[PDB]
Amino acid sequence: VSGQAQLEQLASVAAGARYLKNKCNRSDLPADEAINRAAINVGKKRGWANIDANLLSQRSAQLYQQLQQDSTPEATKCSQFNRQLAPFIDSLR
Amino acid sequence: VSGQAQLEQLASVAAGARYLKNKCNRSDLPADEAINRAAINVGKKRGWANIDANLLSQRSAQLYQQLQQDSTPEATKCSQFNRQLAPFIDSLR
Structure with missing residues (x-):
């Protein structure tokens, strides 16, 4: 997975998830x-390389x-x- | 609990939960x-006396x-x- x-x-x-909330x-x-932290945690659980939270925030806003x-x-x-x-919602909870 | x-x-x-779904x-x-089965299961987990599913259905419809x-x-x-x-939704899942 790239x-x-x-x-x-x-x-x-x-x-x-933000769209659902709002x-x-x-x-x-x-x-x-x-929500951003929970998405980072999904990645961490998969063993993914550290994803920058601010890059995630910028892409998620787009x-x-x-x-x-x-x-x-x-x-x-x-x-x-x-x-x-x-x-995803089950994981964040 | 009576x-x-x-x-x-x-x-x-x-x-x-039915209202949310619909x-x-x-x-x-x-x-x-x-949804009815899941509500019965909540009761069973609490050790409650067997709740009749059809009585539950009738009351839930009201x-x-x-x-x-x-x-x-x-x-x-x-x-x-x-x-x-x-x-409740976390339990049913």
């Missing part, structure tokens, strides 16, 4: 900084903008992300 | 029958109607229930 793919995967889950009424999720600007209806977004992120 | 309170607590979590885009939750007919805005409902049910 460093590029590692960053992309962790940034994707962080961005999606836009899909997932008030059980923790604050953005804690992916969050992508999820926001996409014109898919919000209910469809929220349904998809709640399903796709269920494993 | 039998009445046991039934009410389990029916409440079952009803709320009305709050929680497509990661399982089907109604599995509580679900209550959650539906309440005039609180849906975003507020979904936010509250996602927070309150997070422990």
